[PDB]
Amino acid sequence: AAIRKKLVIVGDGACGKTCLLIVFSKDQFPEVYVPTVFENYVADIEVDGKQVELALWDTAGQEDYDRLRPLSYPDTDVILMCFSIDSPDSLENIPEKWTPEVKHFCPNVPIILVGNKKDLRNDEHTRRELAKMKQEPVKPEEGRDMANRIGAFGYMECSAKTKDGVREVFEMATRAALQARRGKEGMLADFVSQTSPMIPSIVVHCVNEIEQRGLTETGLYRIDGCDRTVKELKEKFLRVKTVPLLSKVDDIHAICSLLKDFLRNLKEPLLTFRLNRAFMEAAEITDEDNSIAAMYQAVGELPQANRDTLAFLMIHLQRVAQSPHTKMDVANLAKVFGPTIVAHAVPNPDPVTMSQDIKRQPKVVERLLSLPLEYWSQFMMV
Ligand SMILES: Nc1nc2c(ncn2[C@@H]2O[C@H](COP(=O)(O)OP(=O)(O)O)[C@@H](O)[C@H]2O)c(=O)[nH]1
Ligand SMILES: [Mg+2]
């Protein structure tokens, strides 16, 4: 019988985690632009005379899944912690976000630091784009240095697109696994404007900034900004009370992350605890006409502040989906916003409940985003 090992992959959204797992397990490079929520794969590998069956646990890199991701950590044998060579920001998040999370939930589990998209290091288009932000591709020595800094078992670079170095990543992860076991915010109402349309200033400002500087950017809302930058912006907002000067933030993705963070951390979700189940049930109705009618009914039950803020957000997200540059259609946006605006029916649900809710959240957002622009616009009085 083969030796079984559990491998969990983590890292910033869109840094290449799924493509790496699929190229290795299926020998085929996925061409679609779709964010992962949670998926499981199986791959075989022969290492040091042993046949090993690797269970590959794919996860979402978005901050929106910070509360749900830990459900994947129990019994992990090795972690693949990734960043992309064409994204210095994704490397910055390795010691700032990923290492603290993994060491908390997976103490003593070996970590392989992986630099993805190696094929882009000398890509001129990539270099020109990074230069606009005064950046450049990550250098090999930087990856190795970071690996030593975080106590990783090793560092490996690869390109799922060219297949270069892919098996080596899993060979090292498998050896690490074998060696390690050898011999062993208040309520929304407190932030909104005085009357209809009742929306928080931070939401209006973020949306306006994003529509001004982000509709031509690939992966809006899928790509998170530097964890530190978002934390600083959030800290200032809640302390100074006024919205920070967003025009001074060079990375528009950080503004997207700020908006999602604000919404996700409200005392209760945008759709409220009281209607959480009603929304999920309405979206789960098989018959489209009946589902749509049930969703209109649920929206009509929301408090004014929640309805107006939701309407403003839906109009904005429809524009994001309609842009030919973002590659973020309704289905993609629903996957990212599910935990952020739907969330759960209680403050601290148990793991069983958290898991049960996962599949139900995106459906709610997809249904809401599919409601007519004319419908949402009435609440904006335009
Ligand atoms: N150039 C290049 N692009 C890649 C590579 N791997 C993934 N990508 C692209 O990066 C984007 C996100 O990939 P994906 O694996 O879905 O990201 P994930 O959110 O970490 O699972 C997609 O456009 C992929 O085609 C790579 O090795 N080289
Ligand atoms: Mg993925």
Side-chain angles (χ1 to χ4, degrees):
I3 297 175
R4 298 194 302 294
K5 295 295 184 180
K6 171 170 177 176
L7 177 159
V8 175
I9 190 166
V10 304
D12 280 11
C15 78
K17 299 182 298 298
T18 299
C19 284
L20 176 58
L21 298 187
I22 300 303
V23 167
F24 175 62
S25 66
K26 295 187 171 68
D27 190 52
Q28 184 57 57
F29 185 78
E31 291 301 312
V32 299
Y33 197 78
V34 177
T36 307
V37 174
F38 289 108
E39 299 299 325
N40 293 260
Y41 302 110
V42 181
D44 307 288
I45 189 172
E46 181 182 59
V47 178
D48 296 314
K50 300 182 180 183
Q51 190 59 54
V52 181
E53 185 180 309
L54 300 172
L56 311 174
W57 293 60
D58 207 354
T59 68
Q62 289 71 37
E63 305 181 306
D64 310 81
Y65 282 91
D66 285 351
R67 296 185 67 186
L68 295 164
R69 193 179 310 104
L71 293 168
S72 310
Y73 294 139
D75 299 308
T76 296
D77 295 306
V78 61
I79 288 283
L80 287 189
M81 190 183 285
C82 310
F83 68 92
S84 173
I85 286 165
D86 83 326
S87 177
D89 286 2
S90 70
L91 176 59
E92 286 289 330
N93 290 330
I94 289 295
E96 287 279 49
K97 177 195 176 62
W98 298 111
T99 298
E101 179 174 305
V102 173
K103 287 187 176 179
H104 174 65
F105 293 108
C106 305
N108 302 303
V109 176
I111 297 164
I112 304 305
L113 181 64
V114 184
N116 290 329
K117 315 190 189 184
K118 183 182 181 183
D119 58 289
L120 298 180
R121 176 169 283 139
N122 301 311
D123 184 71
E124 284 307 304
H125 171 289
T126 291
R127 290 184 173 183
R128 286 192 291 274
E129 293 307 301
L130 283 176
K132 290 181 179 177
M133 293 289 274
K134 299 301 179 181
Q135 303 182 313
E136 61 186 304
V138 179
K139 302 175 181 180
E141 54 265 43
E142 299 187 73
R144 291 196 294 278
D145 181 297
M146 188 61 80
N148 292 310
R149 173 183 171 183
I150 66 176
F153 172 98
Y155 174 65
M156 298 296 275
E157 301 194 327
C158 69
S159 171
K161 196 179 194 66
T162 70
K163 296 183 178 181
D164 179 50
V166 173
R167 186 178 182 291
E168 288 62 46
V169 169
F170 293 91
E171 176 181 55
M172 181 178 274
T174 300
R175 281 172 176 160
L178 294 169
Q179 283 174 45
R181 189 55 48 185
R182 186 175 300 164
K184 303 180 181 180
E185 280 181 43
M187 298 287 277
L188 177 63
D190 303 308
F191 293 102
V192 299
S193 49
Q194 190 131 189
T195 194
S196 316
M198 298 172 209
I199 309 166
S201 62
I202 185 172
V203 170
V204 176
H205 279 65
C206 282
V207 166
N208 287 332
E209 194 65 46
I210 295 165
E211 302 195 326
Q212 176 191 302
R213 299 188 291 150
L215 301 182
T216 63
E217 304 302 298
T218 294
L220 272 190
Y221 291 112
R222 176 178 183 181
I223 296 174
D224 282 304
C226 283
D227 184 55
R228 193 80 257 173
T229 301
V230 181
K231 286 183 177 178
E232 302 175 315
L233 289 170
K234 188 57 187 177
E235 193 289 306
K236 294 184 180 179
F237 172 61
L238 301 177
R239 178 171 58 65
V240 186
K241 302 301 177 180
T242 178
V243 183
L245 184 55
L246 306 181
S247 59
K248 288 185 173 180
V249 183
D250 302 306
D251 178 26
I252 193 62
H253 294 300
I255 303 304
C256 289
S257 294
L258 175 65
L259 175 56
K260 292 189 299 176
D261 185 296
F262 168 73
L263 295 170
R264 191 172 57 260
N265 291 112
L266 288 168
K267 186 172 181 57
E268 94 172 322
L270 181 57
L271 299 185
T272 77
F273 288 135
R274 170 175 165 290
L275 300 172
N276 178 273
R277 264 47 177 141
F279 273 105
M280 295 180 165
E281 286 169 40
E284 300 175 312
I285 293 175
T286 304
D287 184 67
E288 184 163 61
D289 295 304
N290 285 35
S291 178
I292 293 179
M295 193 54 82
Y296 278 129
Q297 181 58 51
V299 175
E301 295 293 302
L302 286 169
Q304 291 301 92
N306 303 253
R307 184 201 73 181
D308 291 351
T309 296
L310 174 64
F312 186 74
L313 180 67
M314 293 293 99
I315 292 172
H316 168 63
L317 293 185
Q318 291 183 337
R319 292 181 181 181
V320 170
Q322 282 157 40
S323 170
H325 309 292
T326 68
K327 298 183 180 181
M328 291 297 284
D329 58 14
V330 170
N332 282 1
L333 291 168
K335 289 174 179 178
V336 173
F337 279 88
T340 292
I341 61 173
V342 185
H344 310 282
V346 298
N348 303 70
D350 49 47
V352 166
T353 302
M354 295 171 74
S355 175
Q356 289 298 303
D357 291 338
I358 299 175
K359 288 181 175 297
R360 316 180 76 188
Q361 303 176 322
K363 302 177 179 182
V364 175
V365 184
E366 277 204 55
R367 287 294 190 180
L368 287 169
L369 284 169
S370 297
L371 294 185
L373 166 62
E374 315 74 60
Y375 170 71
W376 293 123
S377 296
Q378 82 185 85
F379 305 123
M380 302 299 101
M381 292 175 261
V382 300

